[PDB]
Amino acid sequence: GGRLFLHLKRSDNKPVPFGSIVTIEGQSSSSGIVGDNSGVYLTGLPKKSKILVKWGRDKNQSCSSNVVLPEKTDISGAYRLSTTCILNN
Numbered sequence: 001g002g003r004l005f006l007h008l009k010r011s012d013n014k015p016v017p018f019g020s021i022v023t024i025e026g027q028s029s030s031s032g033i034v035g036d037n038s039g040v041y042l043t044g045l046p047k048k049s050k051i052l053v054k055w056g057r058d059k060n061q062s063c064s065s066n067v068v069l070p071e072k073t074d075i076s077g078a079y080r081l082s083t084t085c086i087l088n089n
Contacts, residue, residue: 001044002069004079008038008053010063011086017055025050025064041078045069053085060089 008016015038022032022040032040034053047069054062063085070079 001046002079003043003077004041004045004067004069004081006040006042006065006067007080007082008034008040008063008065008085009082011084016053016063016085020053020055023052023054025052042067047071060087062088064088 010016016034018034018036018038020034021030022034022042023029024031031051032042034040045067049067051065051067052062053065056062065083065085067081067083069081
């Protein structure tokens with residue numbers, strides 16, 4: 001599958017909080033954890049995914065992102081991608 005470093009930034013231009021939990025939309029278990037440079041490393045992904053990034057239970061404490069990988073198959077490396085995490089408010 002696809003592996004990538006994903007740099008997330010909130011729609012309000014703040015970094016995503018260090019320690020936020022990343023999940024595939026529709027799944028309850030963790031996929032990864034946002035680190036101290038507001039990035040996460042993810043593997044086993046299809047070409048197009050949707051993720052939830054969460055650091056609390058209230059309004060404006062989670063955000064949603066699409067994750068679109070380039071088409072190329074059969075490579076061993078990792079993409080360095082960026083996307084917006086749109087706040088759920």
